[PDB]
């Protein structure tokens, strides 16, 4: 068999990620699923496309769907682009060279936010796994991890090397000490989640799930053990949906500042920051108004606090879009006009301008200055077709029919249609026929670029399928009104020919390449085969638990393949209607099944986002093709079999082209190391008057002591007997050195006692025979404080025992 | 007297005499304690 690999992928303008604007209206860097697009906003043409490599379908390619881009961050000064992925991977790209420089893998879930430091040498990343990791780009390593939050990181702010404020989906604001790597402050931002965070000087604004927006003041130098963050006020935004992003922009000439709150709906709400002179003037005015009303001074003071937000904020203007907004970004701020760019969840880019004068804008609604829509479709394509010459690709979705050039990947024509459900080219590649969900048949011409014919009452319900005879003169349409109708093409209009009424809804109609059979899939789980010439019922195919969604008849009209919502592909013999084989093919509903022309091999696509290439004689999967991120709705095969096209719910059209030490032994090693350094310092100190320990970061006494703790008590007494005597004099020196540290001595007083006494008992004869006067002074010292440490514990134990009997005795006397 | 189960529902008290509140535990420590209990019940 000959391998299929992805030749091209297109149709995606903006995927589920943010957008990074780069000034020259400049260019916009957006995601295209696993790739990154760089659009020129003025012209509307794609400048470049970043793709790591490893095309899907290649042998070296991985066996899962590629991880899509989730966040984009670019350092304007250095021309680097960081891309976060849905598997928790960060890749720093060289924009000039268009090649990956660094590859960081420290997060277990999708990356939600990236941020270069001011100097461009560190990269801060938050993720859905609730962790923030600071990366070193010059060192290509992860410096440290911040692990307090308990849900996805929604935002964070770090403009200096000292502090970092972070927000998470558990509703907390956390202030971090980046020198110590610990959380200093923690406040409950909002009762549910907290979705936005923007900081400007002391002012900090956070948005939760509801329309409430909180105002904080950020006093970093407060160092009061708290109060570095104090809540000032709450103001309600118009939209009742959660505010996903907040971004500030300052006008350099006038020092006036604005921010927006991107909502989960189709609106962006811009706000203006009142200057201090305005705030004082407004306060003095309102105080006069309230005083004229007869309120007390204390009530006025509380009311001013109640309306604290109104003094510093001012709703400026609301940008409204036709489509739900996925991301937004400030572009340019000027005393004349205020500009914003956004991407929608329907595969397009929109550029908005707000012209204003002083406080309030000049025009009632913002001006949409630019858009990028031509190279994509807003809704998901439900059916696709390839012209007989294999040069054009028609893709019909809800609201538009776009016709592409398979070589240039560029859309040539766009027609406005209804809720298209099935499309097919007519022979010659010059016309296309649609069956919409309202029962309409719409016929277009590419050259004329217009709608020639519409048949509003072709069917009473959705025209679920649509097939042409090989001659191209007859059209068969099945609908959910439970009828198959036949039409003729006469010079070019459609004329209804005959009707065949079935018992149940019709999901698919297929005519054989020989024009001899008509196969109709019904909602009652059966496929009915007819004789096309006479319309005589021939067979009914039974065996699918759930309805058959696709049919396909082989080039010789011998086999018929059917795919259902029950995840099976059944291959039937069209001589008798018997099932040759039933394949458990996909993990979800199998939407489409297509024979490769002049062969019995076939393709299949499913809702599980996988396209599979099968063998028609062996009933084995040749190749699994993992490229799509969501459901694959439609599939198409070229007449020569040279390539296959699949469109998915993710707005992408993809063209597939045919190509050890024991205890005691460890103790001796520790004694040699710890006491070699102790003797060195002691000798060094006298005259004045290693890597292992530095790596572990422990004193020689603690290092030896930890080795003693790790030895099991059942192994300890034997671990000490194997020690030679020279190591015993070392051990007595370690004990002597421990005694000066009263914290260590009382921490492990019992363990020192058992090991010390056992050593002396085991080899007393050799110890006493030594005439070393230094050894006499060590034993004398070790004796005295060992008693005092032991007596200290015993005096406390004996005192409480007598004290506690007294309590028991007196309670007895008072209650007996 | 012998140390038994935690009187409060929000704490773990072991026969070692050591008590552990579920609030003070880190997530990694809560996982191993969950798996340690699973071994105890499996053979039991």
């Amino acid at each position: 068999y000959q391998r299929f690999e992805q030749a091209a992928a297109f149709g995606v303008i903006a995927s589920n990620a943010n957008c990074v604007w780069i000034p020259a209206p400049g260019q916009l860097i957006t995601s295209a699923l696993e790739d990154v697009n760089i659009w020129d906003i003025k012209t509307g043409d794609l400048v470049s496309k970043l793709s790591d490599g490893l095309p899907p379908g290649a042998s070296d390619a991985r066996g899962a769907k590629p991880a899509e881009c989730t966040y984009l961050e670019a350092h304007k000064d250095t021309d680097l682009l960081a891309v976060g992925y849905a598997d928790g991977v960060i890749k720093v790209w060289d924009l000039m060279s268009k090649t990956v420089l660094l590859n960081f893998n420290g997060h277990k879930a999708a990356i939600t936010l990236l941020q270069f430091d001011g100097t461009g040498t560190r990269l801060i990343s938050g993720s859905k796994d609730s962790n923030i990791i600071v990366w070193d780009l010059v060192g290509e390593v992860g410096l440290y991890k911040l692990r307090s939050h308990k849900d996805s990181i929604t935002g964070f702010w770090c403009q200096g090397e000292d502090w970092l404020i972070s927000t998470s989906k558990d509703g907390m604001i956390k202030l971090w000490d980046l020198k110590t790597h610990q959380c200093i402050e923690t406040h409950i931002a909002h009762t549910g989640e907290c979705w936005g965070l923007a900081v400007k000087d002391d002012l900090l604004i956070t948005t939760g799930t509801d329309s409430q927006v909180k105002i904080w003041k950020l006093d970093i130098e407060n160092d009061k053990m708290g109060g570095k963050l104090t809540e000032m006020g709450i103001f309600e935004k118009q939209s009742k949906q959660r505010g996903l992003k907040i971004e500030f922009i300052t006008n350099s000439s006038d020092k006036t500042s604005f921010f927006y709150i991107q909502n989960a709906d189709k609106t962006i709400e811009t706000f203006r920051i009142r200057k201090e002179e305005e705030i004082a003037r407004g306060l003095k005015k309102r105080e006069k108004r309230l005083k004229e009303k007869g309120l007390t001074e204390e009530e006025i003071a509380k009311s001013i606090k109640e309306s604290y937000s109104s003094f510093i904020l001012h709703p400026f203007q609301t940008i409204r879009s036709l489509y739900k907004i996925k991301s937004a970004s400030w572009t340019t701020v000027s005393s004349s006009k205020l500009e914003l760019v956004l991407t929608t969840s329907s595969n397009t880019i929109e550029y908005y301008s707000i012209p204003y004068e002083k406080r309030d804008p000049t025009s009632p609604a913002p001006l949409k200055t630019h858009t990028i829509e031509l190279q994509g479709q807003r809704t998901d394509v439900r059916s696709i077709d390839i012209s007989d010459d294999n040069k054009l690709l028609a893709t019909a979705s809800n609201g538009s029919l776009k016709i592409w050039n398979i070589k240039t990947h560029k859309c040539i024509r766009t027609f406005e249609c209804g809720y298209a459900l099935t499309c097919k080219f007519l022979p010659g590649g010059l016309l296309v026929i649609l069956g919409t969900r309202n029962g309409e048949l719409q016929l277009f011409d590419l050259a004329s670029s217009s709608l020639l014919d519409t048949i509003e009452d072709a069917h009473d319900a959705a025209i679920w399928s649509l097939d042409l005879t090989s001659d191209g003169k007859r059209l068969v349409t099945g609908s959910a009104d439970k009828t198959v109708k036949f039409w003729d093409f006469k010079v070019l209009k459609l004329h209804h020919d005959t009707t065949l009424e079935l018992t149940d809804d019709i999901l698919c109609v297929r005519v054989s390449p020989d024009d001899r059979y008509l196969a109709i899939s019904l909602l009652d789980n059966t496929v009915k085969v007819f004789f096309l010439d006479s319309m005589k019922f021939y067979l009914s195919l039974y065996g699918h638990k759930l309805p058959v969604l696709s049919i396909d008849i082989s080039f010789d009209s011998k086999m018929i393949i059917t795919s259902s919502a029950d995840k099976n592909i059944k291959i039937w013999g069209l001589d008798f209607g018997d099932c040759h084989k039933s394949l458990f093919a996909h993990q979800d509903s199998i939407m489409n099944v297509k024979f490769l022309p002049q062969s019995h091999n076939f393709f299949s696509c499913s809702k599980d986002a996988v396209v599979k290439y099968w063998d028609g004689e062996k009933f084995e999967c040749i190749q699994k093709l993992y490229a799509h991120q969501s459901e694959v709705w439609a599939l198409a095969v070229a007449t020569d079999g040279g390539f296959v096209v699949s469109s998915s719910h993710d707005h992408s059209i993809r063209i597939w082209e045919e190509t050890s030490l024991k205890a005691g032994e460890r103790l001796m090693e520790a004694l040699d190391l710890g006491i070699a350094e102790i003797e060195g310092l002691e000798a060094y100190n006298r005259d004045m008057k290693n890597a292992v320990l530095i790596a572990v970061n422990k004193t020689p006494e603690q290092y030896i002591m930890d080795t003693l703790l790790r030895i099991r008590m059942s192994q300890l007494e034997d671990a000490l007997m194997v020690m030679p005597f020279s190591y015993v004099l070392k051990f007595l020196k370690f004990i002597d050195t421990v005694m000066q540290n009263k914290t260590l001595l009382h921490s492990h007083l019992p363990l020192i006692c058992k090991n010390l006494f056992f050593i002396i008992k085991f080899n007393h004869k050799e110890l006493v025979s030594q005439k070393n006067e230094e050894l006499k002074l060590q034993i004398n010292r070790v004796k005295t404080e060992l008693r005092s440490a032991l007596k200290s514990t015993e005096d406390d134990l004996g005192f409480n025992v007598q004290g506690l009997k007294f309590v028991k005795q007196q309670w007895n006397l008072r209650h007996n | 007297y012998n140390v038994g189960k935690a009187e409060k529902d929000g704490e773990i008290r072991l026969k070692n005499g050591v008590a552990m509140s579920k609030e003070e535990l880190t997530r990694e420590d809560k996982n191993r304690l969950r798996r340690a209990l699973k071994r105890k019940r499996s053979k039991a």
């Binding site: 402050e185 009762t191 110890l767 050894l775 032991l790 406390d796 025992v801 028991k808 | 050591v18």
Partner: protein, 151 residues
């Protein structure tokens, strides 16, 4: 319910800050109110370690003195449990000693349930006293070694 939740977030955070700074007198008070038994054990453990270098120190002793009846029953229950283990009894004894030296012994008696907690502390403390005492006896092998080395 929001104001108690907001407070409990601050106390948990402040407890961590105090322990890292080593402010044990303030870590002790927060650990007791929050009822975090390990952090209480660590605070007492490492506060005692500094004492080695009256009972705990002037400040943390004062904190134990002002404990009310409910807090004492809670603290003595931990002392009862820590006492059962010989690897942690030393911390319990010094905590028990501080209570007796900074509270009215009469008042400790009327507290309901204290006598039963006290009843469970005595048998273990006697076992710890028989031990340690035996360690003092065993320490005299150093005398016998010294007199032998004099010969």
């Amino acid at each position: 319910e929001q104001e108690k939740a907001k407070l409990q977030v601050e106390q948990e955070q402040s407890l961590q800050n105090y322990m890292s700074k080593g402010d044990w007198t303030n870590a002790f008070l927060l650990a007791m109110t929050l009822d975090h038994p390990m952090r209480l054990f660590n605070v007492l453990k490492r506060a005692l370690g500094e004492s080695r270098s009256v009972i705990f120190n002037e400040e943390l002793d004062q904190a134990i003195s002002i404990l009310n009846d409910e807090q004492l029953i809670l603290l003595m229950k931990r002392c009862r449990d820590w006492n059962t283990n010989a690897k942690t009894h030393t911390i319990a004894q010094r905590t028990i000693r501080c209570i007796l030296m900074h509270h009215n012994i009469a008042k400790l008696s009327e507290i309901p349930g204290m006598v039963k907690i006290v009843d469970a502390i005595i048998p273990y403390t006697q076992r710890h006293f028989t031990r340690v005492d035996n360690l003092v006896e065993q320490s005299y092998i150093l005398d016998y070694a010294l007199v032998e080395m004099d010969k």
